[PDB]
Symmetry: D3
């Protein structure tokens, strides 16, 4: 999908996680988030169209999705442990990574 649709997927599933009433919903939403972040990490955003693939900006953009995906997976592990509230709190913390990328490259 387009990068912007991956972003809508990330945003909508974060909301599902916040309002989830059970572990299965949190796991389902985190899985959809892992997939969207995977589809996005290789894209090139608008504000970076004019840059060498090896530009530290592109490398930094990637690192951001690398960090996000690591955090998504850690929250998913908590959900697999049936620690629903802890998984939801970890999902909240993701937003720091969303925000840090958006501040630089959105």
């Amino acid at each position: 999908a387009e990068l912007e649709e991956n972003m809508h997927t990330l945003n909508d599933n974060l909301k599902h996680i916040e309002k989830a009433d059970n572990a299965a919903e949190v796991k389902d939403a985190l899985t959809k988030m892992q997939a969207a972040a995977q589809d996005a990490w290789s894209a090139t955003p608008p504000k970076l169209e004019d840059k060498s693939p090896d530009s530290p900006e592109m490398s930094d953009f990637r690192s951001g999705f690398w960090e996000l995906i690591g955090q998504i997976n850690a929250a998913l592990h908590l959900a697999k442990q049936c620690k629903v509230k802890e998984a939801q709190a970890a999902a909240e913390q993701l937003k720091t990574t969303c925000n840090a990328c958006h501040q630089k490259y959105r």
Copy 2:
């Protein structure tokens, strides 16, 4: 899967592409390669276990899979155009990227 199993998947499917007799086989194998490279780009290899995630080494390791995946996708586009020989030749060129990573980090 473990990083080493992703590597076996990449290696075996390159061989299928070389010996393929039709576009469907080349597409199938390139698809399996995209998936293995996706599963690998987030891993941390042995020779790099002692490094900051932001270490230019980890960033470089990622860039290598970024490059590989771009080339896999370009070869896949050729196969979707039914340009089997051209796709096979592009698959050959991938090995430069395999080799460059292995020289540094394997």
Copy 3:
């Protein structure tokens, strides 16, 4: 996904079909369209939140996706016959069905 994300999926894949250079791309995009239309036909749109499920409006809304999905499948059959231009022309004709629903319920 939310109804609005199904709509983004339909819109983006129509654009891929228009600019496609081969049958595989058209088939891939039509498949993603079938799936989005399937995810949408059971939803309830905003302008209809206040209506009996059996309201002729909800029945009409459904009929619209029923028609759309039939047309998506017919275009997909053309693509499976490798009739790329004909499939692209059929994809264009879909927009009449998009438009007719939007005029009533969007």
Copy 4:
């Protein structure tokens, strides 16, 4: 699949749900039911082959699968809440919807 195979899938999975000993089995079976009902709602049954797609009969036939799918999803939510007995009881109630369609159109 043919409409009659979707019906066999619905019937067999209802039986699995009745005899299930755990939530995972109920969820698995309800998921297979959602998929079969999705594959069926767009079909046209024998006793209706001679009717305008907009015939209130075809619209009614669709509404029946719309209702069924809503009930399947509600039972699935109960199973995700680990309310196995409640999910099984909701699966029983589905049969009212099966029966009402069959009385008219089977």
Copy 5:
């Protein structure tokens, strides 16, 4: 699925192959056949419920699906070579294997 539903899947997809107008349909149907045969080879049929798993009957029953799956895959290879008529003729030949099993164990 139940063994009898795997059999319905095999039967219906053979019919799709006979009436197919393009390679994609033949491949799609053969793929569904491979999956049904995979789901069946491990089952135990009624007329054999009273037999040691190592009974030469169970071993023979398995061999039959082993043979069938090999033939399904060979027909699929022909379809990937875009040899539609040859794939359809190979699909016809499958029925010898269906028949031989049914004569013994159905």
Copy 6:
């Protein structure tokens, strides 16, 4: 995949099961094992390349995967019952079947 890659998949997932901290991990790993065993049961191993498909050796090789898959499924049922330790103990017992095949045919 090649038979040897199916074997790596079986081996790696057994290790995940041993070190699992929750049911979801055990189920995920057992599912990957079922799939690898399914991909392997139809192969022909090196030490048997020179044998009639109906050779009691090939029939015996198959029986071994038949037994393995039955045991994988039984362990999976325990995991679906949330009996994690019991599922892990059943996964241990699988190794008897791995070993018996390897002694004869590896």
